[PDB]
Amino acid sequence: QIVYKPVDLSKVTSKCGSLGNIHHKPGGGQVEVKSEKLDFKDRVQSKIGSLDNITHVPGGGNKKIETHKLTFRE
Amino acid sequence: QIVYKPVDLSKVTSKCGSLGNIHHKPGGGQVEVKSEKLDFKDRVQSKIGSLDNITHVPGGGNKKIETHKLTFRE
Amino acid sequence: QIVYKPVDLSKVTSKCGSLGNIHHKPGGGQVEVKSEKLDFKDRVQSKIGSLDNITHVPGGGNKKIETHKLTFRE
Amino acid sequence: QIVYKPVDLSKVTSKCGSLGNIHHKPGGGQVEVKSEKLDFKDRVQSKIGSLDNITHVPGGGNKKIETHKLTFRE
Amino acid sequence: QIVYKPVDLSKVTSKCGSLGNIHHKPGGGQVEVKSEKLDFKDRVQSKIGSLDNITHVPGGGNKKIETHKLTFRE
Amino acid sequence: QIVYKPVDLSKVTSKCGSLGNIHHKPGGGQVEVKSEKLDFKDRVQSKIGSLDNITHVPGGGNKKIETHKLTFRE
Numbered sequence: 001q002i003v004y005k006p007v008d009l010s011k012v013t014s015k016c017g018s019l020g021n022i023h024h025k026p027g028g029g030q031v032e033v034k035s036e037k038l039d040f041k042d043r044v045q046s047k048i049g050s051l052d053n054i055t056h057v058p059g060g061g062n063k064k065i066e067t068h069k070l071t072f073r074e
Numbered sequence: 075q076i077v078y079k080p081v082d083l084s085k086v087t088s089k090c091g092s093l094g095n096i097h098h099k100p101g102g103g104q105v106e107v108k109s110e111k112l113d114f115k116d117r118v119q120s121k122i123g124s125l126d127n128i129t130h131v132p133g134g135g136n137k138k139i140e141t142h143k144l145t146f147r148e
Numbered sequence: 149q150i151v152y153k154p155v156d157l158s159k160v161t162s163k164c165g166s167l168g169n170i171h172h173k174p175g176g177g178q179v180e181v182k183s184e185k186l187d188f189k190d191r192v193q194s195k196i197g198s199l200d201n202i203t204h205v206p207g208g209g210n211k212k213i214e215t216h217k218l219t220f221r222e
Numbered sequence: 223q224i225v226y227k228p229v230d231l232s233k234v235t236s237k238c239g240s241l242g243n244i245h246h247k248p249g250g251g252q253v254e255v256k257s258e259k260l261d262f263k264d265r266v267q268s269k270i271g272s273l274d275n276i277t278h279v280p281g282g283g284n285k286k287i288e289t290h291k292l293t294f295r296e
Numbered sequence: 297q298i299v300y301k302p303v304d305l306s307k308v309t310s311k312c313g314s315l316g317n318i319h320h321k322p323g324g325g326q327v328e329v330k331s332e333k334l335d336f337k338d339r340v341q342s343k344i345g346s347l348d349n350i351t352h353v354p355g356g357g358n359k360k361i362e363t364h365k366l367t368f369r370e
Numbered sequence: 371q372i373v374y375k376p377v378d379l380s381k382v383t384s385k386c387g388s389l390g391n392i393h394h395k396p397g398g399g400q401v402e403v404k405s406e407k408l409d410f411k412d413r414v415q416s417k418i419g420s421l422d423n424i425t426h427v428p429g430g431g432n433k434k435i436e437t438h439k440l441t442f443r444e
Contacts, residue, residue, distance in 0.1 A: 002076045004144075010084045018092045028101040028175070028249060028324025028398025033123075034108045040118045049107035050124045051177070055098040058135025058209065059164045060088020065139045070078050072146045076150045078218075082158045090164045095171075101398060102175040102250025102324025107197075109183045117191045123181035126200045129172045132209025134162020141215045144152050148222035175324060176250025225299045226366050228438075232306045236356020238429045240314045246351045249324040249398075251421070255345035261335045268336060271329075274348045283354025283428070289363045292300075296370050298372045302438055306380045310430020314388045320425040323398040329419035334408045342410060345403075346420045357428025358382075360436070366374075367441045 004070040014060040024055045078144045088134040098129045152218040162208045172203045226292045236282045246277045300366045310356040320351045374440045384430040394425045 033049035040046055107123035114120055181197035188194055255271035262268060329345035336342055403419035410416055 004078045004080065006080045008080070008082045008084045012084075012086045014088045016088075016090045018094060019090055020094045022096045024098045025252075025326055025400070026100045026103075027326045027400035028251065029103045030249070030321070030323035030395055030397040031104065032106045036110050038109060038112045038114075040114045040120065041116060043117045044114075045119045046121065048120075048122045049105055049181075050121065050126070051103040051105050052124060052126045052128070053098070053100045054128045054130070055096060056128070056130045057093070057096050058131070059090030059093045059133045059167070060136055060162060062086050062088060062136045063139075064084070064086045064137070066141070068080055068140070068142045070076075070144045074145065074148060078152045079154065081155045084158045086158075086160045088162045090162075092166045093164050093168060095169045097171045097173075099171075099173045099252055099326070100175055100177075101252040101326035101400070103177045103398065104247070104249035104321055104323040104395075105177070105179045107181045111185045112183060112187070114188045114192045114194065115190060118188075119193045120195070122194075122196045123179055124195065124198045124200070125177040125179050126198060126202070127172070127174045128202045129170060129204065130202070131167070131170050131205045133164030133167045133207045134210055136160050136162060136210045138158070138160045138212045140213070142154055143217045143219070144150075145217060145219045146221060148219055173252070175252035175326075177324065178247055178249040178321075180247075223297045224366075225301070227299075227301050228364055229301065229303045232304045232308075232360065234308045234358050234360045236310045236312075236358060236430060238312045238315050238355030240316075241353070241355045241429070242314060242316045243318070244351065244353055245319045245321075246349070247319075247321045248349045249322055251322075251324045251326070251347040253327045253345055253347050255329045255419075257331045257334060259333045261333075261337075262340075263337045265339045266336045266342070267340070268342045269344070269346065271345045272343075272348060274346075276348070276350045276352070278350070278352045279354070281355045284356055284358045285360070287359070287361045291365045291367060293365070293367045293370070295368060298440075300374045300440055302374065302376045302378075304378045306378050306382075306434065308382045308432050308434045310384045310386070310432060312386045312389055312429035314390075315427070315429045316388055316390045318392045318425065318427055320394045320423070322394075322396045322423045325396075325399045325401075325421040327401045327419050327421050329403045331405045331408060333406070336408075336410045336414075338411055339413045340410045340416065341414070342416045342418075343420065344418045346417075346422060348420070348422045350422070350424045350426070352425070353427045355429045357431045359432070360434045362436045364438045365441060367439070367444065369442060370444045
C-alpha cells in the first residue's frame with residue numbers, strides 16, 4: 001500500500017495602501033554588437049544587442065511555484 | 075494499492091488601495107548588431123537587435139504555477 | 149488498484165481600488181541589424197530588429213498555470 | 223581734403239577633390255520644458271524646447287564678412 | 297589732408313584631396329528644464345531645453361572677418 | 371597731414387591629403403535644470419539645459435579675423 005497526501009492551507013498575500021509616483025526616465029544609450037557566425041542548438045535562450053527599458057509595477061507581485069511527484073523508477 | 079491525493083486550500087492574493095502615477099519616459103537610444111550567418115535549431119528562443127520599452131501595471135500580478143505527476147517510468 | 153484524485157479549492161485573486169494615471173512616452177530610437185544568411189529549424193522563436201512599445205495594464209493580471217499526469221511507461 | 227579708398231584684391235577659396243560618405247543617425251531623445259510666463263521684448267532671438275537634427279555639407283562654405291564706415295559725428 | 301588707403305592682397309585657402317567617411321550617431325538623451333517666469337529684454341540670444349545634433353562638413357570652411365572705420369567722434 | 375596705409379600680403383592656408391575615418395558616437399545622457407525666475411537684460415548670450423552633439427569637419431577651417439581703425443574719440 002502506498003499513499004501521497006500533502007495537505008496545504010498556505011497563504012501568500014500582500015496589502016498595499018497605495019502604490020504611487022513611480023518615475024522611470026532612461027537617458028538613452030549606445031549598444032554595438034559584432035560577430036561572424038552564431039550557432040544555437042537545443043533549448044538556448046539568447047539576447048544580443050538590446051537597449052530594453054522595463055517598468056513593472058504589479059499591485060501585488062506574489063508568486064507561488066510548486067512541483068509534486070509520486071514516481072516509480074523515472 | 076496506490077493513492078495520490080494532494081489537497082490544496084491555499085490562497086495567493088493581493089489588495090491594493092490605489093495604483094497610481096506610473097510615468098515611463100525612455101530617452102531613445104542606438105542599437106547596431108552585426109553578424110554574417112545565423113543557424114538556430116531545436117527549441118531556441120532568440121532576440122537580436124532590440125530597443126523595446128515595456129510598461130506593465132497589473133492591478134494584481136499574482137502567479138500560481140503547479141506541476142503534478144503519478145508516473146510508472148517516463 | 150491505482151487512484152489519482154488531487155483536490156483543489158485554491159484561490160488566485162486581487163482587488164485594486166482604482167488603477168490610475170499610467171503615462172508611457174518613448175522618445176524614439178535607432179536600430180540597425182545586419183546579417184547575410186538565416187537558417188531557423190524546429191520550434192524556434194525569433195525576434196530580429198525591433199523598436200516595440202508595450203503598455204499592459206490589466207485590472208487583474210492573475211495567472212494560474214497547471215500540468216497533470218497519470219502516466220504508464222511514457 | 224579727406225580720401226577713404228581701401229583696396230581689396232584678397233581671395234577666400236577652397237578645393238575638395240571629392241566630398242563623400244557622410245552619415246548622420248540621431249537615436250531619438252526626450253525634451254520637456256515647463257514655465258508659466260514669457261516676456262520677450264526688443265531684438266530677442268529665442269529657442270525653447272527643441273530636438274533638431276542638422277546635416278550641413280556645402281561643397282565650399284567659405285564666408286567673407288565685411289564692414290566699412292566713413293563717419294562724421296555718429 | 298587725411299588719406300585712408302589700407303591695401304589687402306591676402307589669401308585664406310585650403311586643399312583637401314578628399315573629405316570622406318564621417319559618422320555621427322547620437323544615442324538619444326533626456327532633457328528636463330523647469331522655470332516659472334522669463335523676462336528676456338534687449339538684444340538677448342537664448343536657448344533653453346535642447347537636444348540638438350549638428351553634422352557640419354564644408355569642403356572648405358574658410359572665414360575672413362573684416363572691419364574698417366574712419367570716424368570723427370563716434 | 372595723416373596717412374593710414376597698412377599693406378597685407380599674408381597667407382593663411384592648409385593642405386590635407388585626405389580627411390577620413392571620423393566617428394562620433396555619444397552614449398545618450400540626462401540633464402535636469404531647475405530655476406524660478408530668469409531676467410536676461412542687454413546683449414546676453416544664454417544656453418540652459420542642453421544635450422547638444424556637434425561633429426564639425428571643415429576641409430580647411432582657416433580663420434582670418436581683422437580690424438582697422440582711424441578714430442578721433444570712439
